Amino acid sequence: MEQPINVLNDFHPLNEAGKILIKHPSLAERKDEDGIHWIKSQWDGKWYPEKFSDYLRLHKIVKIPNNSDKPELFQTYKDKNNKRSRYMGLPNLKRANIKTQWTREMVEEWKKCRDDIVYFAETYCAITHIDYGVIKVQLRDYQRDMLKIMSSKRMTVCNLSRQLGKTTVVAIFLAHFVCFNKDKAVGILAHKGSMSAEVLDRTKQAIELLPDFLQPGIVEWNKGSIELDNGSSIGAYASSPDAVRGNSFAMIYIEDCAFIPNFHDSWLAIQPVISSGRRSKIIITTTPNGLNHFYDIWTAAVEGKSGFEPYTAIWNSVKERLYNDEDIFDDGWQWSIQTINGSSLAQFRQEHTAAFE
Ligand SMILES: Nc1ncnc2c1ncn2[C@@H]1O[C@H](COP(=O)(O)OP(=O)(O)OP(=O)(O)O)[C@@H](O)[C@H]1O
């Protein structure tokens, strides 16, 4: 007699020792509904179509309407044809201090965006589709949760895995912050100034696609910073105490925190900012890098020993990974095995499961 009767013959390297970290898909609940077969995921308890074709089919493909002739359709309207209203002849950018008249519905739609960040993102923000082109973004569940937390909590620390599309949500969040808040100076810090400039570029891209009524008048538009008519701005800097002390930020965003050398001095400098009577917001995102400065920040937050709200998302947050090479749902069995085999368990744990090793 070989292994017992009712024991699966499929094994996974992630289930390295007596502990089952990933359950085989054949053990999952199944059901038929809406004319197709569904399988329940062990990662979020949600139902997913068995066929990738259905998973894709169920996604809404909607383009960002191009309308520069009907102001009555203010939601998609942008007066680019009339260069006068344009910021230095720039078609997609609105000029500052341009006295304008609004209707009642316009004020309500503007307020709705100001108070519902997720609605704002999925109605006026977009991503580029390889073939369908530039379309409205359908936020992944983790992106939706991340947006809500960054917006509702004063200070947030995010421990993420790699390649989750997090820059997309950060850009949207920053665009939302400066477009619906007045006199807010935002500072983006990273190891290298060029890294911060990239985060700023993604944020500028989001603001550029916005319709006239949601888009603030542009006052400044540089590679290292921008300023809007409402007095809000964003600046890209290289992390250092000087950069922190050098400006009075209403919000500081730190990119890839665990990979910033000697971040300790920057962290110390940020303490007065945190404890300031102005109630500044602090947002940190990064993938882990061992037991260094970030591990200390993360642990304090998880332990509830600081004012930071912890948030985490790992490899299974990207649902396309839950379908195998044959376009069949397998809850990520194959994707994780190939990723581990192509690297190692240690690399996978750190890069894809946000472990501190
Ligand atoms: N919710 C989403 N729906 C569809 N596509 C998305 C979504 N979020 C991100 N993407 C796509 O993922 C791609 C990469 O995203 P992004 O640049 O944010 O990744 P990142 O956070 O910089 O990390 P990495 O570059 O390592 O993936 C983009 O081309 C974007 O179109």
From Swiss-Prot:
Region described as ssDNA-binding: 30-94
Family assignment from sequence similarity: Belongs to the Tequatrovirus large terminase family.
Protein name: Terminase, large subunit
A GO molecular-function descriptor: ATP hydrolysis activity
Region ATPase activity, annotated ranges: 131-301
Key words of the record: ATP-binding, Endonuclease, Hydrolase, Magnesium, Metal-binding, Nuclease, Nucleotide-binding, Viral genome packaging, Viral release from host cell
Enzyme class, broadest EC rank: hydrolase
Motif annotated as ATPase coupling, chain positions: 285-287
The keyword Metal-binding is annotated on this UniProt entry: yes
Coiled-coil region list: none
